[PDB]
Write a protein that binds this DNA or RNA. Structure first.
Lengths: 98, 106, 83, 92, 91, 104, 79, 97
DNA sequence: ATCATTTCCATTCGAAGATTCCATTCGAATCCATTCGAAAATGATTACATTCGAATCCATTCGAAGATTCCATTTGAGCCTGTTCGAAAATTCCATTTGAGTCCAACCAATGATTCCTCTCATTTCCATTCAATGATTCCATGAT
DNA sequence: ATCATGGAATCATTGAATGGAAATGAATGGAATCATTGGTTGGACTCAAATGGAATTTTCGAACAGGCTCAAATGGAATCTTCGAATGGATTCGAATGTAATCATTTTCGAATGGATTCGAATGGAATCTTCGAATGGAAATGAT
């Protein structure tokens, strides 16, 4: 039997997803999530498909940015594992919070 | 006779239209005849710089056609365009491949 | 209609993982995924509120890509490609 | 009813710089977004300059101080150059 | 040669009738009004433009305040603006 | 009669109308717009003046100073976020010490 | 050597108003860099405003406009 | 002899300066620094005294903010001492760097 | 928890000065009336978003082995902080100089408005060529031995 | 160190999709002519910003003592990565619905404008008062037993 060591497929995935630009969240889940949120704001709305595509581009771009900063926070704490305390520190210094 | 102001300024970008958008956009009641010339110049210049660096990255990806990934590589590897677009998102740009040193194996 | 509820769970753990990898993340604690779902949820709310505000102002019932683009610029997260 | 973009011009400049390279529809949309963005940043800052100075006109001098404020460093110097040269060519 | 000081002072007397303002605290208040004015007016101008309309009405100012003001501040301000406008028409 | 009176305002509906016309926001300004705007301005001035005043007399003082405005702004959530990116000259900070720096 | 006029005790006072219990010794020069960069970016912008008004005096309003542009809006000096 | 324990006079300095609003850098040096810096951009300029006050208010407000975030970074690393590495992380996350 | 020098905090007084209450004034908002357009409206007409089920593809997740990262701990250095103490230099004061910035007034120069029209640029179908989807392919970095 | 595994990067292959072209439509920028005034220029003037030099109040500092944090190194607990694959979920596609958006020509209102006046808000200059700065002990930590 052959088994990669923990961290190997991770590094290879970093290389794989940093080389690509395709959207990383599947499309239908993200669309339903958009309709749920917007419905809780106003009822009886529809969406141009390009509006959900804008939303999803903006979102993945925001989250990937945030994981960059989260990861700098783990490493600052001498860790390799991103934790919620890392994310929360990123968002507090970004001034999105607290 | 009839020759456009873009020609009289030596420009690829349309001085007339930049003048109409200036008048029609509520920046001030009146637009000197010099302001759209100089603006259309700066816009053409920055378009030229971006396309320059994007074309370069498209030619190291061995492809004919600039795609957003290429604009994104151009912006983020150039220091000053990067800052100009610090708070901007290129749809379908991706990120710059960068792995923190300490995550590499030993 | 049908009832929309619990859709943030549709953003699965593997997709949060892919987003974490494009962002340079080697190892993800198990409490990250729900925290990610939290932050995404706030992000979309703050964008979508403003977009809907532009659409309501246009006396329209269809949210347009321009409404999203205006909201994002307004929110400080300017987007190119729908413009 | 019809719309406007900068595609013909972006495409012209593309031909000047990189004569055998093409541009995709999405890359062009990115470019259109870039021009409209920067247009709005210059025009906005110049408008602010006129108001601050009790003037009703945006002259090429407004556009220029705008460009100095908005663009970083070497980008500013090149762009101011390219604009000043288009303007003298335009008048004289 | 202009300020908002007489109105800031009037409203201050309305709300807390026996307390005063320092000079520089009044400067803070004047700066605050001018900042918020400019944010509302600016966003309203944009809303007009986006909707291909040449005029800024109270509906623009309203959508502006909703975009600009957080939560409960938005809700109270929308009310007190709508009540100033109906009160203004019938009077 | 001034429009401020017919709207019940301490803030100047006329002047706000003139700044609107004269500020390059649009070609034309409805007469409802300076009313509704000056309303919002007087309102927010008032909310800040209330919370600031409160702090001014719980700090044993007669006159609102920037410190009191700063206490008001930062201890209120929605004013704080509205003025997130603003700096009050002479505001100071509001006292906060990280627990882990405390003794014992 | 004017950046040295911002002394160590002044940097430490600012750090205390910021809630800082203990200050490493390399902080003081590092702060001195960051402060200087801050002053550069604002004062450059302020001076541009002065140059455009064809003035020789940088005015508090020039400073305020610069700060607003930099994302550091200041209340209390005329805007 | 009696001497407070290390850390106490610090905590009390925190209490004293968070309780007050005065500018913490002495003013003449800061004026000198401002005039020097401005010279390198345009020669030779003058200043409304209110302009130097505006700059100093903005400077100190920025620095206190930055020490707030720096200190959260130190604490995040299980330390009580702010190090340049902390400032650099704060500035990179803020997007100043 | 024990008593003991620090220091913080409060207190109570006196003037130093900053608010504000008020006299004056001139500039701005009102009024009032009118031209003319921007906004509102309805109605016929797309069109593209929503929805459908069916087929097909792609991604998910459940549950477990064990790798390895996080953390708790000790422990020893090195580097902080706190006590003066001398001491420079920031401050305060005041008084002078005078250059810049302002303020009208007469004046020049350049920007609007507009009508006709021609030249450009938008959009469309048309078609050529790049991109891609897949398949086997050798290459190569990793993991077992 | 050697070699097998499996993922990746590389070979054109065979065609779907996407561009860059070509043909013309309709609309917009250019052209050419002006009241029209904002910009400019200038001559006179006031306000504020050094400057200066002296007292003066005050910070700053160099230098040591020893506390205590920080860092390195250490052990095992626990948590997170990798693995296979049934299947749930998504993606695809073709289509029918119907609903909202958009183009169009009708005027309903509303906001521009501008002249002439009251009234209001700016400013300055005088008092009323709050705030600040003392000196002076009491609660209160905070360090040593």
């Amino acid at each position: 039997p052959h088994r990669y060591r923990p961290g190997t497929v991770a590094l290879r995935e970093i290389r794989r997803y940093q080389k690509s630009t395709e959207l990383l969240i599947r499309k239908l889940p993200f669309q339903r999530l958009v309709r749920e949120i917007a419905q809780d704001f106003k009822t009886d709305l529809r969406f141009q498909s390009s509006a959900v595509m804008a939303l999803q581009e903006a979102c993945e771009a925001y989250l990937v940015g945030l994981f960059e900063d989260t990861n700098l926070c783990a490493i600052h704490a001498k860790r390799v594992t991103i934790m919620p305390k890392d994310i929360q520190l990123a968002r507090r210094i970004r001034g999105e919070r607290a | 006779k009839a020759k456009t102001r873009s020609s009289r300024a030596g420009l690829q970008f349309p001085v007339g239209r930049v003048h109409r958008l200036l008048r029609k956009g509520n920046y001030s009641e009146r637009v000197g005849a010099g302001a759209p010339v100089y603006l259309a110049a700066v816009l053409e210049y920055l378009t030229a710089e971006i396309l320059e660096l994007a074309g370069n990255a498209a030619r190291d990806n061995k492809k004919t056609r600039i795609i957003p990934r290429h604009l994104q590589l151009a912006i983020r590897n150039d220091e000053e365009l990067n800052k100009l677009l610090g708070r901007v998102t290129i749809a379908q740009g991706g990120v710059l491949p960068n792995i923190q040193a300490v995550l590499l194996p030993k | 209609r049908k009832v929309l509820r619990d859709n943030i769970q549709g953003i699965t753990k593997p997709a949060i993982r892919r987003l974490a990898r494009r962002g340079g993340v080697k190892r993800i604690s198990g409490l990250i995924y729900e925290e990610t779902r939290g932050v995404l949820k706030v992000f979309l709310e703050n964008v979508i509120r403003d977009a809907v505000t532009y659409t309501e102002h246009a006396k329209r019932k269809t949210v347009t890509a321009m409404d999203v683009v205006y909201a994002l610029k307004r929110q400080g997260r300017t987007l190119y490609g729908f413009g | 009813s019809r719309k406007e973009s900068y595609s013909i011009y972006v495409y012209k400049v593309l031909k000047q710089v990189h004569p055998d390279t093409g541009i995709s529809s999405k890359a062009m949309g990115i470019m259109n977004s870039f021009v409209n963005d920067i247009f709005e940043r210059i025009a906005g800052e110049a408008s602010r300059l006129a108001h601050y100075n009790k003037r009703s006109t945006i002259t090429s001098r407004e556009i220029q101080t705008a460009v100095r404020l908005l663009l970083p460093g070497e980008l500013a110097k090149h762009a101011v150059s390219e604009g000043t040269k288009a303007v003298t060519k335009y008048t004289s």
